[PDB]
């Protein structure tokens, strides 16, 4: 239960509304017990008085109490729910946005530790599970504790033995039964949290892989795995249902015992008189009514094992410290960028071999560099070091003769343009897929950059307003390839990193793109990763990598004459 402390500390926000809901929950209960307690005594007092005692009996005041308690019961409960549910879902809104804000700082390596469908389960489903903590643990428990004391103290004036017999049963139930239901349901609650997030991960993975699973006949055996998780999840759901049913049955028997004891015990005497008379109905109808205050009490702790399990999931995600940290100092973005690497080494998390081993290159401002190498030789790992995806181990990287780790994050993103090897098409509109880079661009600039990159057919019909991605239109592989080039051309950064930008493009389209890049990327430092040794004459320097090292480095003409690894790439 120590994991709920950070989330009970969100009561400080909206503390006036959350404490107002507690007060109105107490007042609602007091009026609810009083309505049935006054009617039980009023009927018995009136019956005993009879016609003869009409003038001696003050019947107007009880008639006002039952009327007054009727509105207070219905008005209090309505308003208690309004204020408590309003504040609760404002707390859950802030908790959700706060939990989402932790993801991008963890993006390259921290997010790889989790599955994407489980991360989705935490931010939407596990945050929503914590509504139990703000709606139905604090208000029911302190509402029932105050009402029991008010009932016990109030009845103590009439008789001490009867008050503590009813009060003792209620107080013993309040302090002994909910902890019993917490232990009986915490293991189920942990499974219930685990199995819902495992089902959502398996379902999203199963859905996002249906192109491959269907063709290779693995959909059924991956649906069987998913359908087995639902069997376990439904079994845990049924286990919690039996606990609720047992809780309700037991609450009916404890309340029965209080009524039975009050009937038997108060009959002998109430306050020392042989014939209590109407005071018997006072205690019997108090026991019959006061046990409505303990109804939500047992379920407050029974569902806490699932709330604690969820709160651990959110806390784990928000307690992650990002591996890469940026200075808060404000820096000016330079118009010319020349980067320097001296013996850069990098090892991936949970790995033994180095992806980069002593990479060293000096790229002057305005130079265009082509990087060549085998598959899996660290070409993409190099371009991601330059983006501060990871901090290098036993190396140093400098931009304009200043360390790359000393740049403000806003300045680092304004000085580097990247075309990733895998292009993500977001599920927004076409305009928003291009407003990632240069948010202030107009539709005239967005439309023109699409014409240059060859995506003019994408401007037809809805055009910029057309919805792209999931729930909309997929672009082809080439159209995605050209959409990423359009993004990087809009960013307009001094340093441009291109990871195989002309990939999956036909010969004519590639020529048009390479012609466009050559024009737009003038007086820009460009590191272009290619698997195609075409138009390498233009590049002022060619880098050939192998197993995370720069094997040979020189101009296109020099690399052919010496007939190194590059020459074999060209012809062979």
């Amino acid at each position: 239960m120590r994991a709920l402390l950070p989330y009970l500390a969100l009561y400080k926000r909206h503390k006036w509304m959350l404490s107002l809901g507690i007060v109105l929950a107490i007042v609602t209960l007091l009026a609810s017990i009083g309505l049935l307690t006054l009617s039980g005594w009023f009927l018995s007092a009136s019956a005993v008085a009879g016609v003869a005692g009409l003038y001696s009996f003050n019947y107007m005041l009880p008639a006002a109490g039952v009327r007054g308690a009727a509105i207070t019961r219905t008005a209090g409960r309505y308003f208690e729910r309004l204020v408590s549910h309003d504040a609760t879902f404002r707390v859950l809104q802030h908790l959700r946005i706060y939990t989402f804000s932790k993801l991008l700082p963890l993006s390259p390596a921290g997010l790889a530790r989790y599955r994407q469908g489980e991360l989705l389960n935490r931010v939407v489903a596990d945050v929503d599970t914590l509504d139990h903590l703000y709606l139905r643990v604090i208000s029911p428990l302190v509402g029932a504790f105050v009402v029991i004391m008010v009932v016990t103290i109030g009845l103590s004036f009439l008789d001490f033995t009867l008050a503590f017999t009813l009060g003792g049963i209620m107080l013993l139930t309040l302090f002994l039964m909910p902890p019993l239901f917490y232990r009986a349901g915490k293991s189920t609650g942990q499974n219930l949290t685990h199995l819902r997030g495992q089902y959502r991960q398996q379902l999203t993975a199963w859905l996002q892989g249906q192109a491959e699973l269907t063709i290779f006949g693995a959909s059924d055996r991956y649906r069987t795995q998913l359908e087995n998780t639902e069997i376990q999840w439904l079994e845990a759901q049924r286990r919690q249902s039996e606990l609720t049913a047992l809780s309700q049955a037991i609450m009916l028997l404890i309340g029965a015992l209080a009524v039975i004891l009050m009937l038997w015990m108060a009959s002998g005497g109430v306050g020392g008189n042989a014939q209590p008379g109407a005071l018997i109905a006072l205690f019997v109808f108090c026991a019959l009514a006061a046990f409505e205050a303990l109804a939500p009490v047992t379920g407050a702790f029974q569902h806490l094992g699932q709330v604690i399990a969820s709160a651990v999931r959110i806390s784990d995600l928000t307690d992650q410290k990002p591996e890469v940290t940026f200075p808060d100092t404000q820096t000016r973005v330079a118009d010319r960028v020349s980067l320097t690497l001296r013996d850069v080494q990098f090892t991936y998390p949970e790995q033994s071999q180095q992806a980069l081993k002593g990479i060293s290159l000096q790229v002057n401002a305005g130079e265009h560099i082509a990087i060549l190498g085998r598959t899996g030789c660290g070409k993409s790992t190099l371009l991601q070091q330059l983006t501060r995806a990871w901090d290098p181990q036993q190396g140093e990287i400098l931009l304009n003769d200043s360390p790359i780790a000393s740049l403000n994050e806003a300045a680092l993103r304004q000085t580097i343009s990247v075309v990733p090897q895998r292009v993500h098409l977001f599920s927004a509109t076409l305009r928003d897929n291009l407003l990632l880079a240069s948010p202030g661009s107009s539709d005239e600039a967005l439309s023109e950059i699409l014409r240059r990159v060859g995506l003019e057919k994408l401007l037809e019909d809805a055009g910029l307003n057309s919805w792209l991605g999931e729930g909309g239109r997929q672009l082809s592989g080439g159209e995605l390839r050209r959409l990423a080039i359009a993004r990087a051309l809009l960013h307009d950064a001094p340093l441009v990193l291109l990871d195989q930008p002309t990939e999956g493009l036909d010969a004519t389209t590639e020529s048009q793109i390479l012609e466009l890049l050559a024009e737009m990327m003038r007086e820009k430092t460009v590191l272009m990763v290619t698997h195609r040794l075409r138009g390498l004459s233009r590049f002022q320097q060619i880098i050939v990598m192998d197993n995370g090292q720069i094997i040979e480095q020189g101009t296109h003409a020099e690399l052919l004459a010496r007939q190194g690894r590059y020459y074999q790439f060209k012809q062979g």
């Binding site: 006054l38 008085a49 016609v51 009996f57 019947y59 039952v66 308690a69 509105i71 309505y78 729910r81 879902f89 946005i97 804000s101 700082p105 993006s107 790889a112 994407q116 469908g117 989705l120 379902l203 999203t204 859905l207 491959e212 699973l213 269907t214 063709i215 006949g217 693995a218 991956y222 639902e230 049924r238 249902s241 309700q248 009916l252 029965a256 009524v259 039975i260 009937l263 038997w264 018997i280 109905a281 790995q351 033994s352 598959t375 899996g376 983006t387 990733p420 599920s427 990632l436 729930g471 239109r473 997929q474 082809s476 592989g477 999956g504 036909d506 010969a507 004519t508 020529s511 074999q568």
Partner: protein
């Protein structure tokens, strides 16, 4: 909102409950037994209370009524325990069967139709919206009989005692259902927009999570927090709108419940004193009559307050059914599931006659296609990017709908059984994905019981075994989310190992050697060239100089095949291929 649509969703919801019809009737019977036992309990307390208070009977003389009162209490706790478990069991059987229907259709839908929603919105549809139907089946359906029979049985027990008390309860009931229907007319639409905002918030989150790398590249952290804040704020406001309707209806029904309890208490209290004389059968109003009506007054409205509470569970299921019913209605790739199948495992022949390939939204992807690929022959698709080359391969996989003719061995593709057709299919796709946990589980996707010799042959041919020593666990190394453990060219060769592991009647290759350098493209193409000769093959590629032995070359432009023939004829004859080859 439309009431006609809502009336159609309630019919669909009510049909799913037939499987649990026995359990729903048992809870109706058990809920009536609870009404009987609460009348008996109120009668025993009133008889005991009347004897002690008015006749001063010692508690020892009253032992049979205590014995029966305790017995009634024990029986009532047993029925409540039974009824909760019966109702839950009915609800999850219906939920399990509804989710099976949804997942059954998602299998037949394929990747093209799964594209219709963000993957996070599919999860809301399957998890949140099917699970929120429970209280409709478990609670609301049994309650309709209990909302009529239980209050009626309460009243019948009070006419023989006091006819004025039974009219106070019946005088307040008729406004209960009118106010129930008045508050809840907009509850089904408020729930529909609540699930709409939850699916939008869930689909938006998983989309930005999968593109978190592109967001970090461009520094969209502040912008994406606001986009979540907007989607989260909308969901919070739709949730509130659902809740204030359930609080208002609950409060209004509590007002009448409390008004009647006060009215019964005041009527009997004044009747005992003699303030008013009506309401009794020429006999003094006994104290047992007052206690019986007082205990049973809250229980007269319980079945009616529960019906109002479960009327909003019904509205929650109707708003949850709106999105499910739409999915279960939209036609799939082919209107009728094919039953025909082809027996021979020999390479198939493909014929297309005025073939049109369209999206799920009806937009044509490839124009009139007329070609023929004889059995065992291999064809090459080349052309400009965005000319619909990949759409033809997706239509051959059975993923897209087509309007013309597309015959496999003379049998229309839509008439083929999709599961049996896919056993004669193998392909490497554009930007391939690795769904299995490890590298070995991915290569063995086609059949996980392959021999170690067959597995090693695929890894050797696909040039995968060269980077195996780099991986820590070797072939058992997990690949991670979207194969994050592998480089792009390494995941490309793992997808080539899938295609080359089982024999097939037709092999499709979208971009088999993508993201491979000059040398590794040669070794991978050595395996794919030999594999393309073993059966009918349709490869899409941008490489042109490398291919000269392929039987026929198809060039598309704007979704239409415009040249056919071998490399020798097309290279020197001009046209678009020579222009394509010129660069």
């Amino acid at each position: 909102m439309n009431k006609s649509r809502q009336k159609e969703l309630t019919r669909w919801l009510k049909q799913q409950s037939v499987i649990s019809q026995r359990w729903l009737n048992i809870s109706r019977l058990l809920g009536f037994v609870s009404g009987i036992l609460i009348i008996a309990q109120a009668w025993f307390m009133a008889r005991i209370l009347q004897h002690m208070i008015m006749e001063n009977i010692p508690r020892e003389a009253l032992l049979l009524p205590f014995t029966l009162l305790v017995l009634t209490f024990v029986l009532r706790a047993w029925v409540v325990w039974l009824r909760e478990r019966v109702g839950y069991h009915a609800g999850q059987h219906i939920r399990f069967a509804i989710r099976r229907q949804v997942l059954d259709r998602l299998q037949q839908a394929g990747p093209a139709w799964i594209q219709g929603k963000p993957a996070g919105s599919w999860a809301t549809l399957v998890l949140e919206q099917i699970d929120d139907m429970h209280d409709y089946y478990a609670r609301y359906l049994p309650q309709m009989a209990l909302a009529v029979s239980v209050p009626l049985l309460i009243v019948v027990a009070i006419f023989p005692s006091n006819w004025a008390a039974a009219l106070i309860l019946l005088g307040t009931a008729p406004l209960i259902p009118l106010f129930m229907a008045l508050v809840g007319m907009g509850a089904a639409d408020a729930n529909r927009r609540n699930f709409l905002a939850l699916a939008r918030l869930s689909g938006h989150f998983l989309d930005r999570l999968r593109g978190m790398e592109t967001l970090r590249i461009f520094g969209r952290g502040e912008a994406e927090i606001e986009s979540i804040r907007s989607a989260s704020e909308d969901f919070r406001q739709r949730t509130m709108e659902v809740l204030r309707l359930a609080f208002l209806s609950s409060g209004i029904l509590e007002f009448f419940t409390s008004l009647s309890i006060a009215l019964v208490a005041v009527y009997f209290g004044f009747s005992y004193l003699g303030e008013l004389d009506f309401g009794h059968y020429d006999t003094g109003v006994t104290l047992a009559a007052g206690f019986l009506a007082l205990i049973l007054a809250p229980e007269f409205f319980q079945p009616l307050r529960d019906l109002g509470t479960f009327y909003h569970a019904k509205a929650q299921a109707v708003g949850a059914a709106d999105s499910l019913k739409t999915f279960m209605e939209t036609p799939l790739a082919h209107p009728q599931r094919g039953e025909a199948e082809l027996a021979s495992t020999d390479p198939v022949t493909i014929e297309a006659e005025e073939l049109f390939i369209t999206s799920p939204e009806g937009k044509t992807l490839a124009g009139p296609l007329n070609f023929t690929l004889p059995a065992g022959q291999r064809a090459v698709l080349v052309g400009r990017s965005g000319s619909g080359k990949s759409s033809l391969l997706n239509a051959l996989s059975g993923f897209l709908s087509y309007q013309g003719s597309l015959r496999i061995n003379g049998i229309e593709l839509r008439d083929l059984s999709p599961e049996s057709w896919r056993k004669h299919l193998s392909w490497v796709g554009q930007n391939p994905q690795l769904p299995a946990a490890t590298l070995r589980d991915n290569v063995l996707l086609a059949r996980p019981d392959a021999s170690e010799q067959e597995l090693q042959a695929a890894l050797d041919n696909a040039w995968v075994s060269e980077f195996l020593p780099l991986l820590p666990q070797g072939v058992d190394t997990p690949v991670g989310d979207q194969a994050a453990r592998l480089s792009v060219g390494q995941a490309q060769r793992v997808a080539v190992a899938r295609a080359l592991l089982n024999p097939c009647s037709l092999l499709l290759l979208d971009e088999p050697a993508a993201s491979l350098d000059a040398h590794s493209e040669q070794r991978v193409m050595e395996a794919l060239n030999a594999a393309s000769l073993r059966q009918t093959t349709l490869m899409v590629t941008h490489q042109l100089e490398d291919l000269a032995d392929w039987d026929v070359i198809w060039v598309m432009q704007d979704g239409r095949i415009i040249e056919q023939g071998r490399y020798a004829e097309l290279s020197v004859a001009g046209g678009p291929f020579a222009t394509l080859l010129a660069h």
